[PDB]
mmCIF file of all heavy atoms in Angstrom:
data_model
loop_
_atom_site.group_PDB
_atom_site.id
_atom_site.type_symbol
_atom_site.label_atom_id
_atom_site.label_comp_id
_atom_site.label_asym_id
_atom_site.label_seq_id
_atom_site.Cartn_x
_atom_site.Cartn_y
_atom_site.Cartn_z
ATOM 1 N N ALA A 1 114.151 82.204 150.277
ATOM 2 C CA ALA A 1 114.031 83.657 150.216
ATOM 3 C C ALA A 1 114.897 84.322 151.278
ATOM 4 O O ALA A 1 115.475 85.392 151.043
ATOM 5 C CB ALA A 1 112.567 84.067 150.381
ATOM 6 N N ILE A 2 115.012 83.696 152.448
ATOM 7 C CA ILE A 2 115.861 84.250 153.500
ATOM 8 C C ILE A 2 117.322 84.269 153.059
ATOM 9 O O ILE A 2 118.032 85.263 153.264
ATOM 10 C CB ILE A 2 115.671 83.462 154.807
ATOM 11 C CG1 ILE A 2 114.259 83.681 155.362
ATOM 12 C CG2 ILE A 2 116.662 83.926 155.842
ATOM 13 C CD1 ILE A 2 113.915 82.746 156.489
ATOM 14 N N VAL A 3 117.796 83.175 152.448
ATOM 15 C CA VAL A 3 119.173 83.135 151.949
ATOM 16 C C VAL A 3 119.418 84.266 150.957
ATOM 17 O O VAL A 3 120.424 84.987 151.039
ATOM 18 C CB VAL A 3 119.472 81.760 151.316
ATOM 19 C CG1 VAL A 3 120.808 81.769 150.532
ATOM 20 C CG2 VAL A 3 119.501 80.687 152.387
ATOM 21 N N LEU A 4 118.502 84.444 150.001
ATOM 22 C CA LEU A 4 118.752 85.384 148.919
ATOM 23 C C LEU A 4 118.495 86.842 149.298
ATOM 24 O O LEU A 4 118.888 87.725 148.534
ATOM 25 C CB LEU A 4 117.930 84.987 147.693
ATOM 26 C CG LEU A 4 118.621 83.811 146.991
ATOM 27 C CD1 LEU A 4 117.653 83.024 146.135
ATOM 28 C CD2 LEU A 4 119.773 84.342 146.164
ATOM 29 N N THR A 5 117.901 87.131 150.461
ATOM 30 C CA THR A 5 117.719 88.516 150.889
ATOM 31 C C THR A 5 118.553 88.880 152.115
ATOM 32 O O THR A 5 118.362 89.966 152.670
ATOM 33 C CB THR A 5 116.243 88.832 151.169
ATOM 34 O OG1 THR A 5 115.693 87.873 152.075
ATOM 35 C CG2 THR A 5 115.420 88.829 149.870
ATOM 36 N N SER A 6 119.471 88.014 152.544
ATOM 37 C CA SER A 6 120.372 88.316 153.649
ATOM 38 C C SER A 6 121.684 88.909 153.140
ATOM 39 O O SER A 6 122.124 88.629 152.025
ATOM 40 C CB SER A 6 120.663 87.050 154.467
ATOM 41 O OG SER A 6 119.502 86.597 155.153
ATOM 42 N N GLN A 7 122.316 89.724 153.981
ATOM 43 C CA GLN A 7 123.655 90.203 153.662
ATOM 44 C C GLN A 7 124.638 89.044 153.738
ATOM 45 O O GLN A 7 124.418 88.070 154.459
ATOM 46 C CB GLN A 7 124.075 91.312 154.627
ATOM 47 C CG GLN A 7 123.070 92.462 154.731
ATOM 48 C CD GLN A 7 122.958 93.275 153.457
ATOM 49 O OE1 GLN A 7 123.948 93.505 152.754
ATOM 50 N NE2 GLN A 7 121.742 93.733 153.161
ATOM 51 N N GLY A 8 125.729 89.155 152.990
ATOM 52 C CA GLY A 8 126.673 88.061 152.851
ATOM 53 C C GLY A 8 126.652 87.471 151.452
ATOM 54 O O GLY A 8 126.271 88.125 150.473
ATOM 55 N N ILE A 9 127.054 86.200 151.367
ATOM 56 C CA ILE A 9 127.221 85.484 150.110
ATOM 57 C C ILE A 9 126.182 84.363 150.054
ATOM 58 O O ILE A 9 126.284 83.390 150.818
ATOM 59 C CB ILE A 9 128.638 84.910 149.962
ATOM 60 C CG1 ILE A 9 129.696 85.985 150.196
ATOM 61 C CG2 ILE A 9 128.814 84.276 148.570
ATOM 62 C CD1 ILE A 9 131.123 85.419 150.177
ATOM 63 N N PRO A 10 125.199 84.428 149.157
ATOM 64 C CA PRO A 10 124.184 83.365 149.104
ATOM 65 C C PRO A 10 124.694 82.110 148.415
ATOM 66 O O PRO A 10 125.378 82.162 147.392
ATOM 67 C CB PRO A 10 123.040 84.000 148.306
ATOM 68 C CG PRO A 10 123.732 84.984 147.406
ATOM 69 C CD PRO A 10 124.899 85.530 148.225
ATOM 70 N N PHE A 11 124.306 80.968 148.975
ATOM 71 C CA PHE A 11 124.787 79.659 148.551
ATOM 72 C C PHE A 11 123.578 78.748 148.413
ATOM 73 O O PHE A 11 122.822 78.579 149.375
ATOM 74 C CB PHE A 11 125.787 79.127 149.587
ATOM 75 C CG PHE A 11 126.393 77.779 149.268
ATOM 76 C CD1 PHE A 11 127.700 77.685 148.792
ATOM 77 C CD2 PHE A 11 125.693 76.605 149.531
ATOM 78 C CE1 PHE A 11 128.292 76.432 148.545
ATOM 79 C CE2 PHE A 11 126.277 75.345 149.285
ATOM 80 C CZ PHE A 11 127.571 75.265 148.798
ATOM 81 N N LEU A 12 123.406 78.156 147.224
ATOM 82 C CA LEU A 12 122.297 77.253 146.933
ATOM 83 C C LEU A 12 122.836 75.878 146.568
ATOM 84 O O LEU A 12 123.844 75.765 145.873
ATOM 85 C CB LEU A 12 121.448 77.787 145.774
ATOM 86 C CG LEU A 12 120.901 79.208 145.927
ATOM 87 C CD1 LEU A 12 120.310 79.652 144.580
ATOM 88 C CD2 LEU A 12 119.838 79.284 147.015
ATOM 89 N N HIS A 13 122.159 74.833 147.035
ATOM 90 C CA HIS A 13 122.491 73.469 146.655
ATOM 91 C C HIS A 13 121.796 73.132 145.341
ATOM 92 O O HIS A 13 120.620 73.455 145.159
ATOM 93 C CB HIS A 13 122.043 72.507 147.759
ATOM 94 C CG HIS A 13 122.493 71.092 147.571
ATOM 95 N ND1 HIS A 13 121.622 70.022 147.628
ATOM 96 C CD2 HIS A 13 123.728 70.566 147.376
ATOM 97 C CE1 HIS A 13 122.301 68.899 147.454
ATOM 98 N NE2 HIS A 13 123.580 69.203 147.305
ATOM 99 N N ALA A 14 122.525 72.504 144.420
ATOM 100 C CA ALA A 14 121.907 72.144 143.145
ATOM 101 C C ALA A 14 120.651 71.310 143.384
ATOM 102 O O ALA A 14 120.684 70.298 144.088
ATOM 103 C CB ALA A 14 122.879 71.371 142.254
ATOM 104 N N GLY A 15 119.540 71.743 142.799
ATOM 105 C CA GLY A 15 118.272 71.060 142.958
ATOM 106 C C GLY A 15 117.402 71.619 144.055
ATOM 107 O O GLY A 15 116.212 71.283 144.121
ATOM 108 N N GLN A 16 117.961 72.450 144.936
ATOM 109 C CA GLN A 16 117.132 73.151 145.909
ATOM 110 C C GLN A 16 115.982 73.866 145.213
ATOM 111 O O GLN A 16 114.886 73.976 145.772
ATOM 112 C CB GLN A 16 118.005 74.138 146.688
ATOM 113 C CG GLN A 16 117.298 74.919 147.759
ATOM 114 C CD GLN A 16 118.244 75.832 148.529
ATOM 115 O OE1 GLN A 16 119.457 75.610 148.566
ATOM 116 N NE2 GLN A 16 117.692 76.874 149.134
ATOM 117 N N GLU A 17 116.200 74.300 143.967
ATOM 118 C CA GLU A 17 115.179 75.018 143.215
ATOM 119 C C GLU A 17 113.972 74.152 142.872
ATOM 120 O O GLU A 17 112.885 74.698 142.650
ATOM 121 C CB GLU A 17 115.786 75.610 141.937
ATOM 122 C CG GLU A 17 116.273 74.612 140.884
ATOM 123 C CD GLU A 17 117.705 74.133 141.110
ATOM 124 O OE1 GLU A 17 118.226 74.295 142.240
ATOM 125 O OE2 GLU A 17 118.303 73.588 140.152
ATOM 126 N N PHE A 18 114.128 72.833 142.817
ATOM 127 C CA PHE A 18 112.971 71.955 142.668
ATOM 128 C C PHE A 18 112.797 71.045 143.883
ATOM 129 O O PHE A 18 112.356 69.904 143.760
ATOM 130 C CB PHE A 18 113.008 71.160 141.357
ATOM 131 C CG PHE A 18 114.298 70.441 141.068
ATOM 132 C CD1 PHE A 18 114.548 69.186 141.611
ATOM 133 C CD2 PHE A 18 115.213 70.971 140.166
ATOM 134 C CE1 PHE A 18 115.718 68.499 141.302
ATOM 135 C CE2 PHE A 18 116.385 70.296 139.855
ATOM 136 C CZ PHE A 18 116.638 69.050 140.424
ATOM 137 N N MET A 19 113.124 71.575 145.068
ATOM 138 C CA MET A 19 112.852 70.909 146.346
ATOM 139 C C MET A 19 113.493 69.524 146.400
ATOM 140 O O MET A 19 112.860 68.537 146.790
ATOM 141 C CB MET A 19 111.346 70.817 146.610
ATOM 142 C CG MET A 19 110.722 72.104 147.111
ATOM 143 S SD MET A 19 110.773 73.368 145.842
ATOM 144 C CE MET A 19 109.962 74.717 146.712
ATOM 145 N N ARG A 20 114.758 69.464 145.992
ATOM 146 C CA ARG A 20 115.509 68.214 145.917
ATOM 147 C C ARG A 20 115.330 67.357 147.163
ATOM 148 O O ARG A 20 115.420 67.851 148.293
ATOM 149 C CB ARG A 20 116.989 68.535 145.713
ATOM 150 C CG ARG A 20 117.883 67.308 145.621
ATOM 151 C CD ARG A 20 119.294 67.735 145.212
ATOM 152 N NE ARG A 20 120.184 66.585 145.065
ATOM 153 C CZ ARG A 20 121.438 66.647 144.629
ATOM 154 N NH1 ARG A 20 121.995 67.814 144.306
ATOM 155 N NH2 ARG A 20 122.141 65.535 144.524
ATOM 156 N N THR A 21 115.078 66.067 146.945
ATOM 157 C CA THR A 21 114.949 65.097 148.017
ATOM 158 C C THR A 21 115.942 63.964 147.798
ATOM 159 O O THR A 21 116.299 63.642 146.662
ATOM 160 C CB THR A 21 113.508 64.538 148.106
ATOM 161 O OG1 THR A 21 113.428 63.567 149.163
ATOM 162 C CG2 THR A 21 113.093 63.877 146.797
ATOM 163 N N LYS A 22 116.420 63.393 148.907
ATOM 164 C CA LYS A 22 117.211 62.171 148.884
ATOM 165 C C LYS A 22 116.459 61.027 149.550
ATOM 166 O O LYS A 22 117.073 60.059 150.010
ATOM 167 C CB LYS A 22 118.572 62.394 149.546
ATOM 168 C CG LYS A 22 119.498 63.349 148.753
ATOM 169 C CD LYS A 22 120.705 63.775 149.589
ATOM 170 C CE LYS A 22 121.720 64.571 148.742
ATOM 171 N NZ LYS A 22 122.909 65.019 149.548
ATOM 172 N N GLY A 23 115.133 61.130 149.601
ATOM 173 C CA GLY A 23 114.327 60.106 150.241
ATOM 174 C C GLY A 23 114.658 59.917 151.700
ATOM 175 O O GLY A 23 114.522 58.805 152.223
ATOM 176 N N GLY A 24 115.115 60.970 152.375
ATOM 177 C CA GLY A 24 115.426 60.883 153.783
ATOM 178 C C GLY A 24 116.856 60.509 154.107
ATOM 179 O O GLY A 24 117.211 60.476 155.291
ATOM 180 N N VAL A 25 117.688 60.222 153.104
ATOM 181 C CA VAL A 25 119.081 59.864 153.371
ATOM 182 C C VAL A 25 119.832 61.079 153.908
ATOM 183 O O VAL A 25 119.860 62.148 153.281
ATOM 184 C CB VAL A 25 119.747 59.296 152.106
ATOM 185 C CG1 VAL A 25 121.240 59.082 152.337
ATOM 186 C CG2 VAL A 25 119.084 57.978 151.698
ATOM 187 N N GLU A 26 120.474 60.908 155.067
ATOM 188 C CA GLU A 26 121.127 62.019 155.752
ATOM 189 C C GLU A 26 122.528 62.297 155.199
ATOM 190 O O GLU A 26 122.939 63.457 155.104
ATOM 191 C CB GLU A 26 121.197 61.730 157.252
ATOM 192 C CG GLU A 26 121.960 62.769 158.058
ATOM 193 C CD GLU A 26 122.409 62.240 159.417
ATOM 194 O OE1 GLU A 26 122.417 61.000 159.613
ATOM 195 O OE2 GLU A 26 122.748 63.061 160.295
ATOM 196 N N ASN A 27 123.282 61.254 154.843
ATOM 197 C CA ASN A 27 124.682 61.404 154.416
ATOM 198 C C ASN A 27 124.899 60.533 153.179
ATOM 199 O O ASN A 27 125.190 59.340 153.308
ATOM 200 C CB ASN A 27 125.623 61.007 155.551
ATOM 201 C CG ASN A 27 127.097 61.134 155.182
ATOM 202 O OD1 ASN A 27 127.457 61.764 154.191
ATOM 203 N ND2 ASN A 27 127.959 60.525 155.996
ATOM 204 N N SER A 28 124.782 61.124 151.984
ATOM 205 C CA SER A 28 124.670 60.334 150.759
ATOM 206 C C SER A 28 126.009 60.140 150.038
ATOM 207 O O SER A 28 126.014 59.810 148.848
ATOM 208 C CB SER A 28 123.632 60.958 149.816
ATOM 209 O OG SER A 28 124.032 62.245 149.338
ATOM 210 N N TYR A 29 127.135 60.252 150.761
ATOM 211 C CA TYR A 29 128.459 60.313 150.134
ATOM 212 C C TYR A 29 128.757 59.148 149.190
ATOM 213 O O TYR A 29 129.468 59.336 148.196
ATOM 214 C CB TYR A 29 129.552 60.396 151.208
ATOM 215 C CG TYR A 29 129.822 59.109 151.961
ATOM 216 C CD1 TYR A 29 130.936 58.338 151.676
ATOM 217 C CD2 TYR A 29 128.972 58.689 152.971
ATOM 218 C CE1 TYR A 29 131.196 57.169 152.384
ATOM 219 C CE2 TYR A 29 129.225 57.536 153.678
ATOM 220 C CZ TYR A 29 130.328 56.779 153.378
ATOM 221 O OH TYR A 29 130.566 55.622 154.090
ATOM 222 N N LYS A 30 128.250 57.940 149.473
ATOM 223 C CA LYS A 30 128.465 56.816 148.558
ATOM 224 C C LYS A 30 127.158 56.130 148.171
ATOM 225 O O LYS A 30 127.178 54.985 147.681
ATOM 226 C CB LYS A 30 129.442 55.787 149.146
ATOM 227 C CG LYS A 30 128.933 55.054 150.385
ATOM 228 C CD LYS A 30 130.012 54.116 150.941
ATOM 229 C CE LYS A 30 129.499 53.335 152.144
ATOM 230 N NZ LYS A 30 130.583 52.553 152.812
ATOM 231 N N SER A 31 126.029 56.797 148.390
ATOM 232 C CA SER A 31 124.739 56.256 148.004
ATOM 233 C C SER A 31 124.641 56.168 146.482
ATOM 234 O O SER A 31 125.278 56.945 145.765
ATOM 235 C CB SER A 31 123.609 57.133 148.542
ATOM 236 O OG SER A 31 123.636 57.187 149.958
#
């Protein structure tokens, strides 16, 4: 909600809408 009500350009990560998890993986570039 903070992202979408702030001035500027809002940016969402795909799956943020369903609380996307990577099981704790910090950097998944080749996972």
Side-chain angles (χ1 to χ4, degrees):
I2 293 169
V3 169
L4 282 158
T5 53
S6 292
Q7 307 293 323
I9 308 175
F11 181 104
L12 305 170
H13 188 231
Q16 181 177 338
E17 66 274 17
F18 50 84
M19 282 67 179
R20 180 172 182 175
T21 179
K22 292 168 172 179
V25 173
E26 175 199 17
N27 180 15
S28 65
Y29 74 103
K30 66 183 182 188
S31 299

